[PDB]
């Protein structure tokens, strides 16, 4: 009725602070894993060159 | 404003306690008496110093109510008794 | 042809985006709950039992 | 789970058929254990067979060493099948609870009958053989899962709090592993990320140094009877035997890929015996396979290569983390619009409260300025 | 050049890109009052982080699809000098192709 309740009350602020940091840590890691991915596609000039060769030019 | 109590402090000064980092610091440099953000926290000097927070009428931009799906957890068990029910 | 090639990756990216949205929504819900708790704390109308609940 | 009259009727009706089934299972399990024991004594390492002594460095108390006193029989498939090992494990649980009840009966004579009435009214400590139909078995499994839910969080919190209060991780990867180990079951933990915690904790507390209270929590979470607990080397022996059998079966399954061919119900049972898949979660085959594969990955390549599993304390915490449900939150957010201290409104504010409101209210800056100016004037006048 | 068409992937959930964008707009619209701007060198907020992640994924998907809206892609996807160079190379190429097509039709 008295003792355990008081010590639970004492624990609340630190646990709240640590869990807020843990949540921020998760969000930070989520952002850090994001990285714009640029793709490379076959240049059309080689297509235009193969087109020309096929013509027997 | 009302006369109701706030988060208990135990008569401690949060600017010099062993868990001071757990209490946010305001612009004036006075650490809060609670995990919450307090704008008007003060310190009083009796034989020992103690932190005090005075409730006041302050408006805070209220984010709209979320859906019950994203904050309700239906993991209650027969042995479980909530803090309100225990009180 | 290009669309047919870049199709599984697009589907995975869309699913990942949906999962990310569903992951962020609870965070905003917790933020709103904390805002309301702070509002009641500043008024002096917040018991520790309610905060723990 | 709490006792009920319906369960009491169920267990009283199936009492004698249950006892007969338990006796038959006892004969079968004795045969299986005899095969396994003969193989262990014949082909086991010298330290394992001779029961080498490992003492703690502080009080020199003997306890089972995971490296020396546990041995994975890689060639057990020749003599004993996977299903037989599962049968032996299930029988070991049932036999432990039955043995405790029989000991109580022998100790207290006929005065244990009312306690037997309390016993048959709950499925927590009755054997699985007492269920003769699917629905009864489902309720029994629900009771076991409820006990696991009740007991596991205390074990996890004990481990985490003691370590965090008395030690910290060495490097960032260990920090991430330790933090992600104790996440709730609503999120999926990557075994590769979490594995380093095993070595980190091996530096702190090996299975040979596990404390008696932590052992009691673990045995509660494993549905192992804990009264009378006695010395920690009895229930510790039970834990070691159970997980040694589990690791033998795991090696068999991993090597022969039995889980892929394993049917849905048998797969669910296999996960459940590893404390990975609660029945109340209504998992499908995809989720069960995901959890089982994560368990195998957590065991790691070294398990297959040399039969060496990670630290047993961390392994138990990892698997029991599936019973660490998110903290319950019930009630609409509109309930946060109410007030908690309306009953004090009639009292008003006394002189001291009014003074505090005046000094720390919106006019606090003006009051501070006036007070400081007055004090400065008085100090100047005094000088 | 590409090789083999990649293995087929089955979606875990069903949702359209338009629906996803609308959901993102709704999610970010309710926090506009709470959202506060700050200097680029200052630490970011939760709302800013969520907006950046969601918009980055959305516009990466759009650019892969073909909706080459450079005005927003330069805002929600550019975070590296290499990224800026790639965007400039892509910005020139699309304009050149458009001009060539128009000239070849005229
Ligand atoms: C009539 C007088 C009575 C005296 C008073 C008694 C008072 C009550 C005290 C308790 C008495 C025992 C109760 C019955 C237990 C059931 C039998 C048994 O041992 O089960 C195995 C099981 C073994 O447990 P374990 O942890 O796996 O053992 C680890 C070993 O490594 C396991 O070895 P392993 O890993 O190599 O595997 C072997 C395993 C492999 O086997 C199998 O896998 C097959 C299954 C075999 C076991 C089956 C057990 C079934 C239990 C249920 C029975 C049905 C109940 C039905 C109920 C309803 C009835 C209507 O087989 C075994 O389990 C063999 C264990 C060793 C034998 C123990 C028996 C020794 C005593 C009997 C001989 C006495 C001779 C007297 C001679 C007199 C000379 C002057 O026993 C238990 O669960 C332990 C008992 C739990 C309660 C403990 C209570 C405190 C005890 C304190 C005693 C202190 C000394 C006495 C004085 C007390 C004063 C305060
Ligand atoms: C036919 C059947 C088949 C054949 C038989 C088969 C064999 C059967 C036997 C074996 C069965 C084993 C399994 C049993 C499981 C059930 C155990 C149990 O009790 O569960 C709790 C059970 C309910 O269990 P549940 O609902 O299923 O929940 C289980 C959960 O999992 C909750 O689980 P939990 O883990 O949370 O609960 C555990 C809890 C278990 O405990 C309890 O739950 C406590 C139960 C009692 C609570 C009483 C509350 C009410 C008090 C009323 C007071 C009187 C009111 C006014 C009456 C006015 C009348 C006019 O705590 C403990 O385990 C503590 C253990 C303590 C051990 C103490 C050891 C002492 C050793 C001494 C030191 C020695 C040192 C060495 C010295 C050496 C020297 C040389 O409690 C009850 O049902 C309460 C019954 C209350 C009866 C009425 C009040 C007492 C009446 C007394 C009448 C006296 C008449 C004569 C008077 C004469 C005067 C001259
Ligand atoms: C606000 C006011 C309210 C009222 C308050 C009342 C006043 C209280 C004042 C003082 C209270 C504190 C006293 C503490 C004393 C010191 C305790 C101590 O040193 O403990 C050391 C130590 C601590 O216990 P532990 O094993 O470490 O774990 C205890 C945890 O609670 C284990 O917890 P766990 O979570 O690990 O396990 C949970 C679960 C786990 O479940 C299981 O393990 C499965 C089920 C197991 C069933 C039991 C198996 C027993 C196997 C054999 C045990 C050895 C027998 C030895 C020979 C027999 C000696 C008689 O276990 C249970 O649920 C246990 C159920 C037990 C129910 C009985 C509890 C007592 C209720 C009252 C009934 C008796 C009334 C008699 C007086 C009235 C007469 C008219 O105790 C032991 O080593 C246990 C030895 C047991 C020896 C037998 C009992 C000896 C005492 C004499 C019995 C007399 C019987 C009379 C029959 C009727 C005659 C007419
Ligand atoms: C209602 C019934 C009432 C019953 C009353 C009787 C008492 C209770 C009965 C039993 C109650 C149940 C629970 C008991 C405790 C359980 C302990 C436990 O969990 O052990 C697990 C443990 C199993 O684990 P494990 O891994 O297999 O082996 C342990 C590891 O080695 C562990 O490895 P470690 O690294 O820990 O190694 C250390 C370990 C090494 O030890 C062991 O573990 C080995 C087993 C014990 C060996 C003890 C014998 C040592 C040599 C004795 C030499 C005496 C020579 C004297 C010659 C005289 C010539 C004139 O421990 C020691 O070193 C301790 C040694 C003992 C020191 C004794 C000091 C006493 C000082 C006396 C002060 C003064 C007294 C008053 C004045 C008297 C004179 C005027 O069990 C055992 O090892 C044996 C347990 C035996 C239990 C007791 C059986 C009771 C039988 C009762 C018969 C009489 C009944 C009378 C009834 C009367 C009417 C009602
Ligand atoms: C309503 C009330 C009615 C009246 C009640 C009257 C009450 C009388 C008050 C006086 C009683 C004092 C004793 C209290 C015992 C409880 C202490 C306790 O639980 O501490 C927790 C304590 C704290 O553990 P922890 O802090 O969690 O962890 C620390 C360590 O890590 C733990 O790690 P660990 O477990 O590995 O290390 C411990 C272990 C390590 O060692 C081993 O593992 C090796 C085991 C070696 C066993 C050696 C046995 C030698 C036996 C020789 C017999 C020769 C045969 C002779 C035959 C002919 C003569 C009869 O060594 C032991 O603890 C065993 C030491 C020797 C046990 C001897 C049997 C018990 C004697 C009790 C009577 C003492 C005199 C009482 C009168 C004077 C009082 C001032 O844990 C233990 O000690 C666990 C073992 C507990 C076993 C003892 C209790 C057994 C149950 C007794 C059944 C009989 C019931 C009779 C009921 C009577 C009712 C009237
Ligand atoms: C802590 C509390 C204390 C009080 C209490 O609760 C726990 O203690 C509990 C202990 C209880 C007794 C335990 C055991 C029996 C025997 C049974 O008997 C079966 C029928 C026959 C045997 O089958 C009876 O035939 C006999 O057969 C014997 C040969 O076999 C002959 O010799 C004997 O003459 C002859 O009568 C009849 C019931 C009774 C008396 C119980 C009553 C209720 C309690 C007093 C409880 C009670 C509520
Ligand atoms: C009241 C007491 C109750 C006791 C209950 C438990 C009883 C258990 C009985 C098990 C019997 C096992 O039987 C026993 O097995 C061992 C191990 O394979 C055999 O052991 C044999 O092979 C081993 C291994 O190569 C040799 O080290 C040993 O020298 C040789 O005898 C024994 O020859 C046999 O007698």
Task: Annotate chain D with three-state secondary structure.
Answer: CCCCHHHHHHHHHCHHHHHHHHHHHHHHHHHHHHHHHHHHHHHCCHHHHHCCCCECCCCCCECCCCCCCCCCCCCHHHCCCHHHHHHHHHHHHHHHHHHHHHHHHHHHHHHHHHHHHHHHCCCCCCCHHHCCCHHHHHHHHHHHHHHHHHHHHHHHHHHHHHHHHHCCCCCHHHHHHHHHHCCCCCCCCCHHHHCHHHHHHHCCCCHHHCCHHHHHHHHHHCCCCCCCCCCHHHHHHHHHHHHHHHHHHHHHHHHHCHHHHCCHHHHHHHHHHCCCCCHHHCCCHHHHHHHHHHHHHHHCHHHHHHCCCCCHHHHHHHHHHHHCCCCCECCCHHHHHCCCCHHHHHHCCCHHHHHHHHHHCCCHHHHHHHHHHHHHHHHHHHC
Distance D113 CA to ligand 6 centre (A): 9
Q: Does E15 touch chain C (CB under 8 A)?
A: yes
CA D306 to mean position of chain CA atoms: 26
Question: Ligand 4 within 6 A of D51 CB?
Answer: no
Put simply, the answer to whether C36 touches D333 (Cβ < 8 Å) is yes
Q: What is the resolution of this structure in A?
A: 3.2
CA distance D273 to D267: 10
Alpha-carbon dihedral angle through residues B14, B20, B24, B25, given to the nearest 10 degrees:
70
CA D281 to mean position of chain CA atoms: 17
Question: Which residues, in sequence order, are CB contacts of D44 under 8 Å at separation 6+?
Answer: D71, D73
Q: Nearest C-alpha of chain B: how many angstroms from A23?
A: 15
Q: Nearest C-alpha of chain C: how many angstroms from D193?
A: 20
CA distance D143 to D258: 29
- The enclosing H or E element of A17 equals helix A3-32
Encoded tokens for A17:
């602070």
Which residues on neighbouring strands pair with residue B49, listed in sequence order? B45
Find the largest Cα–Cα distance for chain E: 53
Put simply, the answer to whether C42 touches B5 (Cβ < 8 Å) is no
Place of tokens 């903290």: D327
Among residues D185, D217, D205, the alpha carbon closest in space to that of D312 is found at: D205
Distance A23 CA to ligand 5 centre (A): 47
CA distance D66 to C26: 42
Task: Annotate B12-62 with three-state secondary structure.
Answer: CCCCCCCCHHHCCECCCCCECCCCCCCCCEEEEECCCEEEEECCCCCCCCC
CA distance E6 to E28: 34
- Atom from ligand 5 closest to the CA of residue D62: 36
Distance D228 CA to ligand 5 centre (A): 11
Would you call B83 helix, strand, or coil by DSSP? helix
CA distance E13 to D104: 55
Angle CA(B41)–CA(B47)–CA(B48) in degrees, nearest 5? 45
CA distance D82 to D94: 19
Distances (CA, A) of D287 to D177, D185, D205, D268, D278: 22, 13, 32, 10, 11
Per-window interface: D 222-251 vs C, CB < 8 A:
none
* Cα nearest neighbour of E33 on chain B: B61
Encoded tokens for D15:
């009492």
Put simply, the answer to whether B35 touches A13 (Cβ < 8 Å) is yes
Question: Ligand 4 within 6 A of D61 CB?
Answer: yes
Q: Nearest C-alpha of chain E: how many angstroms from B61?
A: 6
Quickly count: other Cβ atoms within 10 Å of residue D371's Cβ: 11
- Atom from ligand 2 closest to the CA of residue D125: 13
Residues belonging to chain B with any Cβ–Cβ distance to chain D shorter than 8 Å = 1-5, 40, 42, 52-54, 56, 65-66, 68, 71-80
Question: Ligand 3 within 6 A of D17 CB?
Answer: no
- Atom from ligand 3 closest to the CA of residue D125: 44
Put simply, the answer to whether D340 touches C40 (Cβ < 8 Å) is yes
Question: Ligand 2 within 6 A of D143 CB?
Answer: no
Rg (alpha carbons) of chain A, rounded to whole number: 31
Question: Ligand 6 within 6 A of D113 CB?
Answer: yes
Cβ atoms of residues B7 and D341 within 8 Å: no
Specify the pairing of strand B49-53 against strand B41-45: antiparallel
Q: Whose CA is nearest to atom 98 of ligand 1?
A: D107
Which residues on neighbouring strands pair with residue D55, listed in sequence order? D62
CA distance D303 to D50: 23
Sign of the C-alpha dihedral, residues B12, B14, B15, B19?
Answer: positive
Cβ atoms of residues D279 and D141 within 8 Å: yes
Alpha helices in E66-105 (DSSP H): 70-76, 81-105
Encoded tokens for C33:
């709950």
Question: Ligand 7 within 6 A of D133 CB?
Answer: no
N- to C-terminal Cα separation, chain A: 97
Question: Which residues, in sequence order, are CB contacts of C27 under 8 Å at separation 6+?
Answer: A23, A27, E46, E50
Sign of the C-alpha dihedral, residues D235, D236, D238, D239?
Answer: positive
User: How many C-alpha atoms does D322 have within 13 Å on its Cβ side?
Assistant: 24
Q: Whose CA is nearest to atom 1 of ligand 6?
A: D111
Encoded tokens for D55:
């003492």
Quickly count: other Cβ atoms within 10 Å of residue D94's Cβ: 21
Q: Nearest C-alpha of chain D: how many angstroms from C2?
A: 32
Per-window interface: C 1-53 vs A, CB < 8 A:
2, 6, 20, 23, 27, 30, 48, 51-52
Distance B64 CA to ligand 5 centre (A): 61
Task: Annotate chain C with three-state secondary structure.
Answer: CHHHHCCHHHHHHHHHHHHHHHHHHHHHHHHHHHHHHHHHHHHCCCCHHHHHC
Among residues E38, B53, A14, A11, the alpha carbon closest in space to that of C38 is found at: B53
N- to C-terminal Cα separation, chain E: 32
Question: Ligand 5 within 6 A of D234 CB?
Answer: no
Q: In this structure, what DSSP letter does residue B68 have?
A: G
- Compute φ and ψ for A6, nearest 5 degrees: -65, -40
Q: Nearest C-alpha of chain E: how many angstroms from B23?
A: 20
Burial class (CB in 10 A: 0-12, 13-18, 19+), D306: exposed
Q: Which residues of B touch A14 (CB under 8 A)?
A: 19, 22
Place of tokens 């338009």: E18
Question: Ligand 4 within 6 A of D107 CB?
Answer: no
Put simply, the answer to whether D329 touches C53 (Cβ < 8 Å) is yes
Q: What DSSP string describes E12-76?
A: SS---HHHHHHHHHHHHHTTTTT-----TTSPPPHHHHHHHHHHHHHHHHHHHHT---HHHHHHH
Put simply, the answer to whether D340 touches C46 (Cβ < 8 Å) is yes
């Amino acid at each position: 009725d008295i003792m355990v309740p008081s010590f639970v009350y004492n624990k609340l602020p630190v646990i709240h602070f640590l869990q807020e940091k843990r949540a921020e840590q998760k969000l930070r890691r989520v952002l850090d894993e994001t990285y714009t991915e640029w793709t490379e596609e076959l240049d059309q000039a080689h297509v235009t060159d193969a087109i020309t060769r096929s013509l027997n030019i | 404003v009302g006369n109701g109590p706030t988060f208990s402090t135990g008569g401690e000064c949060m600017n010099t306690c062993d868990i001071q980092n757990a209490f946010p610091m305001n612009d004036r440099g006075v650490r809060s008496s609670s995990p919450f953000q307090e704008p008007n926290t003060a310190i009083y000097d009796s034989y020992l110093a103690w932190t005090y927070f005075q409730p006041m009428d302050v408006h805070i931009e209220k984010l709209p109510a979320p859906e019950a799906k994203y904050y309700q957890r239906h993991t209650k068990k027969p042995w479980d008794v909530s803090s309100t029910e225990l009180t | 042809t290009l669309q047919q090639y870049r199709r599984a990756s697009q589907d995975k990216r869309l699913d990942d985006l949906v999962d990310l949205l569903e992951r962020f929504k609870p965070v905003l819900a917790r933020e709103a709950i904390m805002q309301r708790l702070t509002i009641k704390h500043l008024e002096g109308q917040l018991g520790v039992w309610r905060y723990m609940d | 789970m709490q006792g009920s009259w319906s369960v009491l009727k169920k267990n009283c009706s199936n009492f004698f058929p249950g006892l007969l089934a338990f006796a038959q299972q006892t004969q079968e399990a004795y045969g299986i254990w005899l095969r396994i024991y003969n193989r262990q004594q014949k082909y086991g390492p010298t330290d394992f067979v001779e029961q080498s002594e490992t003492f703690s460095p502080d009080y020199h108390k003997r306890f089972h060493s995971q490296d020396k006193n546990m041995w994975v029989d890689k060639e057990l498939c020749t003599e004993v099948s996977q299903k037989e090992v599962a049968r032996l494990m299930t029988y070991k649980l049932d036999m432990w609870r039955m043995a405790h009840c029989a000991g109580a009966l022998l100790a207290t004579g006929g005065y244990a009958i009312p306690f037997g009435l309390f016993w048959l009214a709950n499925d927590t400590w009755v054997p699985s053989s007492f269920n003769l139909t699917g629905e009864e078995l489902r309720a029994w499994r629900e009771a076991q899962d409820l006990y696991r839910y009740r007991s596991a969080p205390s074990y996890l919190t004990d481990t985490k709090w003691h370590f965090d209060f008395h030690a910290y991780p060495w490097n960032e990867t260990q920090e991430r592993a330790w933090d992600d180990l104790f996440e709730k079951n609503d999120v999926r933990r990557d075994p590769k990320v979490v594995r380093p915690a095993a070595e980190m904790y091996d530096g702190f507390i090996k299975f040979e140094l596990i404390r008696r209270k932590s052992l009691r929590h673990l045995c509660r979470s494993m549905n192992i009877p804990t009264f009378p607990m006695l010395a920690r080397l009895c229930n510790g022996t039970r834990v070691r035997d159970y997980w040694n059998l589990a690791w033998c079966e795991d090696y068999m399954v991993i090597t022969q890929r039995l889980h892929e061919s394993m049917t849905d119900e048998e797969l669910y049972d296999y996960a459940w015996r590893r404390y990975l898949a609660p029945y109340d979660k209504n998992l499908n085959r995809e989720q069960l396979m995901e959890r089982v594969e994560d368990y195998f990955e957590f065991l790691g390549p070294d398990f297959v290569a040399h039969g060496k599993a990670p630290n047993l304390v961390i392994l138990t915490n990892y698997v029991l983390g599936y019973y660490n449900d998110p903290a319950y939150l019930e009630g609409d957010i509109s309930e946060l619009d109410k007030n908690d201290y309306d009953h004090l409104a009639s009292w008003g504010k006394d002189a001291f409260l009014r003074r505090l409101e005046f000094e720390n209210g919106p006019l606090r800056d003006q009051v501070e300025a006036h007070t400081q100016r007055l004090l400065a004037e008085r100090a100047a006048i005094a000088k | 050049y590409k090789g083999e068409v990649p293995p087929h992937y089955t979606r875990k959930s069903s949702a359209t890109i338009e629906q996803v964008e609308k959901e993102i707009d709704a999610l970010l619209g309710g926090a506009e009052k709470l959202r506060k701007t700050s200097t680029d060198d200052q630490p970011m907020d939760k709302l800013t982080l969520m907006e950046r992640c969601l918009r980055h994924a959305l516009w990466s998907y759009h650019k892969e699809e073909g909706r080459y809206d450079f005005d927003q892609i330069g805002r929600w996807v550019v975070y590296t000098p290499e990224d800026e160079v790639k965007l400039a190379q892509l910005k020139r190429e699309v304009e050149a192709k458009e001009k060539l097509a128009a000239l070849r039709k005229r």
